[PDB]
Design a protein around this ligand. Sequence first.
Ligand code: HEM
Ligand SMILES: Cc1ccc2cc(N)ccc2n1
Ligand SMILES: Cc1ccc2cc(N)ccc2n1
Length: 394
Amino acid sequence: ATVLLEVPFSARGDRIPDAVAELRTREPIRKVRTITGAEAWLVSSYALCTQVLEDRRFSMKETAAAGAPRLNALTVPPEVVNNMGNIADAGLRKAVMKAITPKAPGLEQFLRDTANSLLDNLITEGAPADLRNDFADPLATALHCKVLGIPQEDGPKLFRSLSIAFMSSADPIPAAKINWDRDIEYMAGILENPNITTGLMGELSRLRKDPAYSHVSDELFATIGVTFFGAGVISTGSFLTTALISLIQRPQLRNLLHEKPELIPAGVEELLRINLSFADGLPRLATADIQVGDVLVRKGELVLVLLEGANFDPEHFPNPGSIELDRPNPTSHLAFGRGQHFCPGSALGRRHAQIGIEALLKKMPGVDLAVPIDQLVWRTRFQRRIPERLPVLW
Ligand code: HEM
Ligand SMILES: Cc1ccc2cc(N)ccc2n1
Ligand SMILES: Cc1ccc2cc(N)ccc2n1
């Protein structure tokens, strides 16, 4: 006897397992067991993934209900899974969205200046350099301090919560509550701090004292700061790190982007499409009985939308494992989701990766891995796939 197929399949972010294409062809929705022991429906074709993400009867918020089959344990309060919903209900969606666009005056120059300073410090120190810990993550942390309006020197301590906050664990994590409560107290202090007048926290601090928002809770305001810092920093640092691996492993493309930097936006869109940074399918709970392909998903069951299942589907992206800069459907991948919950940080995430890549290719045009690829250590039981260190020379 064999056991029910377990997810996730591999924590490696540098290769897609051959199993995914076999599942997609044979059984694009099928039962799997998650790390909690729950059953779920794993959805792996582009057609069926888009169906589930575009049907709100597959609910994000209901994944937090007591008693439901779980992908992993909550690392935040259950009402917090619903954070964007709550932002919208408080009338704060347009203001949050405006504050996190990469369009603010000087923001792109700040990203460039910060990427160049981090790269000059690595060049001074000499090879090997670690492009995750000493490049992509500090660039993500400095960008999000600037976008929030909070001091750059507060970025490292907020960042240190993330290796626990974004765990994908079978059981509750006592350190995640200690760090969440601390980080909420920090963001509540920021809303009372008269020096914080710019970015997303300066805007929320003003709206807090405006009569049109006098009954929005102080818990929501602090929560938006902790959730957007952590989600933005983990998502952009982890995607930049694993896109740098895919670029370094393609020297022909690396040289083409170095020679024609105007192609970096189209290269970043293909690196988003092939990115394996999400370690688990996106979870949803059925709120009704709904036909998905050959399966009737029933009310209360867990569905997992496998982003690389959709993004490597050759029926939608022919020659899916190849980076092609002239596809006719280049932004139609699911790297930022789809539907009601499509990432509000999409533009910021694209600009962070374009600027970090442009700066790296100008400063270190000979960048290459300093260890054999199989020597990267892939973090396990985490919501992202990331190498613990990314050693390069140039
Ligand atoms: C390359 C970088 C990023 C990637 C690949 C990314 C990916 C995603 C994906 C796949 C979703 C959908 C989750 C779902 O439907 O279950 C999402 C949602 C979200 N993202 Fe991003 N993200 C990125 C950057 C950011 C940034 C920069 C921020 C904020 C500063 C951010 C904040 C959020 C929030 C708050 C949600 C939940 C939206 C809702 O529930 O309606 N993300 N992200
Ligand atoms: C439930 C949830 C909430 C916020 C999220 C933010 C992201 N960048 C990615 C996935 C997210 N998922
Ligand atoms: C045997 C079985 C299996 C899964 C079911 C899910 C439901 N929502 C209702 C009845 C069910 N019955």
